[PDB]
Amino acid sequence: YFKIYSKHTPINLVRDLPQGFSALEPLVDLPIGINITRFQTLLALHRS
Amino acid sequence: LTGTGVLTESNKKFLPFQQFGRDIADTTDAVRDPQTLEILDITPCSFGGV
């Protein structure tokens, strides 16, 4: 079971992580049943 | 989930993910019913010493 917990917070700090408390609500409980050992995030380019 | 109790209206603001509730004993104290998604409080039936 692959659990995705998520939280959106309105912040106004410029560079680093804000200091505070915010509990992440569970978003998606996903029935995959596969082995996961490595991950990679996806970014978006801007073309001009 | 099996059990005995009186099902009553409740004022506990459950969050969308939250389904049931548990007491100190870990016995279910509130539950979200399927099909109608409402939140029913579970209060153990009256008992005592005769």
Ligand SMILES: *[C@@H]1O[C@H](CO)[C@@H](O)[C@H](O)[C@H]1NC(C)=O
């Ligand atoms: C999951 O993958 C890792 C690395 O590929 C491997 O060492 C491990 O034995 C795998 N586990 C299962 C249950 O396949």
